[PDB]
């Protein structure tokens, strides 16, 4: 028996072999009954959204926009003060982005049905970082780790605002 | 735990779990926002 590298008292999970964040961490075996490509796509998207949202917290409490609506240093209270109209526009824009970036196939059964789709690979690289394949793997691992850390931190900041109410500081 | 998970995948257990979860979130919506006669918006 091999046993996992992360959880040393557990057997090595299956389906994670050719990935860019494999430390053998899957005690519940989510990769066995869920497609690993979909799981990586979801992890990357959740991580990127969490990173953007954490940066949004830190900037919102600091900078903010001119106007009476955009005057709440607290993100949770800003979600309510801003009203539904600005939020629904963000929702529709995110939907438009989702549709055009995945080119129609948006669901768990439709995406990766034909393969030829690296999980999380939207081809988005205008600044050109990533031409060298040597640093590409390191960049992918850094993105994954930062995304996970940002998921934890996004939960932390949101719940700090809920239990205190003032801000993050 | 290979056949136990298959037993939990049977129609009665899955229907009971799904209906319990469904009644649960319905009851909790009606607890946190009670007496909702019209759409909140």
């Amino acid at each position: 028996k091999v046993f996992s590298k992360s959880v040393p008292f557990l057997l090595k999970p299956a389906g994670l072999d050719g990935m860019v964040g494999d430390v053998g961490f899957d005690p519940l075996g989510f990769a066995t009954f869920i497609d690993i490509r979909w799981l990586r796509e979801a992890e990357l998207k959740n991580g990127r959204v969490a990173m953007l949202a954490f940066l949004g917290f830190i900037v919102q409490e600091f900078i903010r926009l001119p106007g009476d609506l955009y005057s709440e240093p607290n993100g949770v209270k800003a979600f309510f003060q801003v009203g539904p109209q600005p939020l629904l526009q963000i929702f529709l824009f995110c939907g438009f982005l989702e549709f055009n970036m995945h080119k129609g196939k948006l669901t768990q059964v439709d995406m990766f049905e034909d393969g030829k789709r690296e999980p999380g690979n939207f081809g988005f690289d205008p600044l050109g970082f990533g031409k060298d394949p040597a640093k590409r793997e390191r960049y992918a691992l850094a993105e994954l780790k930062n995304g996970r850390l940002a998921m934890i931190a996004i939960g932390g900041l949101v719940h700090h605002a809920l239990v205190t109410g003032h801000a993050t500081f | 735990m290979k056949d136990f998970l298959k037993y939990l995948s049977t129609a009665p257990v899955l229907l009971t779990a799904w209906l319990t979860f469904t009644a649960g979130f319905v009851i909790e919506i009606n607890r946190f926002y009670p007496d909702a006669l019209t759409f909140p918006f």
Partner: protein, 739 residues
């Protein structure tokens, strides 16, 4: 390698949990139509068709009994836990006559918190009609901590019974010879179970319930009453209430049992303080029952040259009119579980009905006679359980006749001779049923039409043509004269229902002489007629379960089959199951009439309030005597009149009873769709629905089929019973809680 058990017969594995229908040879292949799903549950406990060995069936039955007892223990633990945590038992103890027992509080969701009623004692909740508070008080339980510990013990016992079932199916399963030791089983169930349970309960009553309840009746608050264990460690806390414990057990071993007359009395009547039976009388009763049952347990020969053989007893009881007599009955009852189930279920339902009668007749718990909802609920529930169990006993007798009956082994015995003249039995029972129905009901209809025609002197009433139940009144007179004449050591009659004084607790009547007039004559004959018709249906099912003039090979079609075909003019419902279906309907009718008679008679001529000068005013006002003799009277002065509380319960704490009233009406009417219709129409409608699904590519692989004819009948009867019983349940509960 024990001689009674087999070790590790079945492996404890989850593999068969993932293969539904593995027990059945036909269902194991997997579902092809939706009929497979229904067949899966209809054959789950039919262990006879799952194995060909009586040993395996017996082991499955034994483990199923353990599972059932674990379920019962869990239910009891839940009841005690609710009494401990979600009840006003402590408040009810200090004010039994003014606080309504409640042991279930309702969460505040969707406005349902209105169900939390003003039961009293600074408590809100649902009023409890199961009488647990009175039972706990009779047990001497004076604190909710004791209820919590009883609940914990119940949980432990339930786990123990679950473990016992698992152990005796998978680790050490008894052999067939162990199960067939009916002599040993009877000896143990009679001495150990019954007698030693009575003895242990007598000990508990004498040492815990007798002193604690005596202190409670004396006015001592539950907080200053000593803890129950102190009544055992200290022979002076109990010797003050009963000054006979000072002599210890010496009077018992010296045969001077007269010294124990302090706490082993024979009084009769009711306790004037609580309205229940004297707990000293109860303890003496349980002691006598224990001795009698222990003696009765030393009857059958088990392992020594001592006792009786049931085979030799039965085989010696022949006669000129009965041929071989009881020869072969021992083989029938030791090789067929269905025959044992028939006898046990019939006698068990009859026992439940007898219990229901003796409950209200002689209230055995403190402050339970003045809790009218508890009395009504207990009587109705126990009578319903008795009727259901009796129908089940008839059903399993029919099942035994179809399946486990061997013609060769029963040559010219009682079973054979009964089948040989089944025609005579059924024809005479038919004539008796027609006679009884004609008379009882047509006397009712004659009263109704005489009243409708303005001829009040032509009725079958007391102020008219009178049918006095003289035989029952003679018995009532004999019982009220028994103390001092035939029961010379009695101080009071067994029940005040036979006659005597009005017993009131807190201005509420506990018991009172139940007068019998022409109204009781008619309703008693209605009871006899309904019981006779139910017996007719069930006995026709049992006797004609194997063959008939219509179908000479009905036994080859099994116990459960819809018909033999449209031929012979139509052979619907010829089974024996279709007789347990019709008998279920008629049992519902009979029990409904019985509980209606009880409710109206008690409310009109027993229950009520007593004025300080001794004037008795009842709940309804004595309208039973003159208005229960016509069907219009039953419709108006009982149904319409006492349904006022149910229909006016909306917005109050009894609104749940109105909702259940309406829902039970809905379910009862829903049943008629299955009872009146047939399978072909529903199959052909499912055909068009399946066409639509196929048109939308959503037709299930498991082909949807309409419920089988037998299952359609079963669904119809189940819904009918549920709706009717629920309607009566809501009506009774709302009416008797409001007033």
């Amino acid at each position: 390698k024990s001689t009674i058990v087999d070790f590790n017969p079945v492996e404890t594995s989850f593999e068969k949990w993932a293969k539904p229908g593995q027990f059945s040879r036909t269902l194991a292949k997997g579902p092809k139509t939706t009929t497979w799903i229904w067949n899966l549950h209809a054959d789950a406990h039919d262990f006879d068709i799952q194995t060909n060995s009586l040993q395996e069936v017996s082991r499955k039955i034994f483990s199923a009994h353990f599972g059932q007892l674990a379920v019962i223990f869990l239910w009891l633990s839940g009841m005690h836990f609710h009494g401990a945590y979600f009840s006003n038992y402590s408040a009810w103890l200090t004010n039994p006559t003014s606080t309504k027992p409640s042991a279930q509080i309702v969460w505040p969701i969707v406005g349902q918190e209105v169900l939390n009623a003003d039961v009293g004692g600074n408590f809100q909740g649902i009023q409890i009609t199961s009488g647990f508070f009175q039972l706990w008080r009779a047990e001497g339980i004076t604190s909710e901590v004791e209820l919590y510990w009883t609940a914990v013990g119940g949980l432990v016992a339930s786990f123990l019974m679950l473990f016992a079932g698992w152990f005796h199916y998978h680790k050490a399963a008894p052999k067939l010879e162990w199960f067939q030791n009916v002599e040993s089983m009877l000896n143990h169930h009679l001495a150990g179970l019954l007698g030693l349970g009575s003895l242990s309960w007598a000990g508990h009553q004498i040492h815990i319930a007798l002193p604690i309840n005596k202190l409670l009746d004396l006015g001592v608050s539950p907080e200053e009453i000593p803890l129950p264990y102190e009544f055992i460690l200290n022979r002076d806390l109990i010797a003050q209430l009963y000054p006979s414990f000072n002599k210890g057990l010496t009077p018992f071993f010296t045969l001077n049992w007269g010294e124990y007359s302090d706490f082993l009395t024979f009084k009769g009547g009711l306790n004037p303080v609580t309205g229940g039976l004297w707990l000293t009388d109860t303890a003496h009763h349980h002691l006598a029952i224990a001795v009698l049952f222990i003696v009765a347990g030393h009857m059958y020969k088990t392992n020594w040259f001592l006792g009786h053989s049931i085979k030799t007893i039965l085989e010696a009881h022949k006669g000129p009119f009965t041929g071989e007599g009881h020869k072969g009955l021992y083989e029938v009852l030791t090789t067929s579980w269905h025959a044992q189930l028939a006898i046990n279920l019939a006698l068990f339902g009859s026992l439940s009905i007898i219990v229901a009668h003796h409950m209200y007749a002689m209230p055995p718990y403190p402050y339970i006679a003045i809790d009218y909802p508890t009395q009504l609920s207990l009587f109705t529930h126990h009578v319903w359980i008795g009727g259901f169990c009796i129908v089940g006993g008839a059903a399993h007798g029919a099942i035994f006749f179809v399946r486990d009956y061997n013609a060769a082994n029963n040559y010219n015995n009682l079973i054979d001779r009964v089948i040989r003249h089944r025609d005579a039995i059924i024809s005479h029972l038919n004539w008796v049923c027609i006679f009884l129905g004609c008379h009882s009901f047509g006397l009712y209809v004659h009263n109704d039409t005489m009243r409708a025609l303005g001829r009040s002197q032509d009725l079958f009433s007391d102020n008219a043509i009178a049918l006095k139940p003289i035989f029952a009144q003679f018995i009532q007179n004999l019982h009220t004269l028994a103390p001092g004449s035939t029961a010379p050591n009695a101080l009071t009659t067994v029940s005040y229902a036979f006659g005597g004084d009005v017993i009131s607790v807190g201005s509420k009547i506990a018991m009172m002489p139940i007068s019998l007039g022409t109204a009781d004559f008619l309703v008693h004959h209605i009871h006899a007629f309904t019981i006779h018709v139910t017996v007719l249906i069930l006995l026709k099912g049992v006797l004609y379960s194997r063959n008939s003039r219509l179908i000479p090979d009905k036994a080859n079609l099994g116990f459960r089959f819809p018909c033999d075909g449209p031929g012979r003019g139509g052979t619907c419902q010829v089974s024996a199951w279709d007789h347990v279906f019709l008998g279920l309907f008629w049992m519902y009718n009979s029990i409904s009439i019985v509980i209606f008679h009880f409710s109206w008679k008690m409310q009109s001529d027993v229950w009520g309030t007593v004025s300080p000068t001794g004037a008795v005013s009842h709940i309804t006002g004595g309208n039973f005597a003159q208005s229960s003799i016509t069907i219009n009277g039953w419709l108006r002065d009982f149904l319409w009149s006492q349904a006022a509380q149910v229909v006016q319960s909306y917005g109050s704490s009894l609104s749940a009873y109105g909702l259940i009233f309406l829902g039970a009406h809905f379910i009862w009417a829903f049943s008629l769709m299955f009872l009146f219709s047939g399978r072909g129409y529903w199959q052909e409608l499912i055909e068009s629905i399946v066409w639509a699904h196929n048109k939308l590519k959503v037709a299930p692989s498991i082909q949807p089929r309409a419920l089988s004819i037998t299952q359609g009948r079963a669904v119809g009867v189940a819904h009918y019973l549920l709706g009717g019983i629920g309607t009566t349940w809501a009506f009774f509960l709302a009416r008797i809680i409001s007033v």
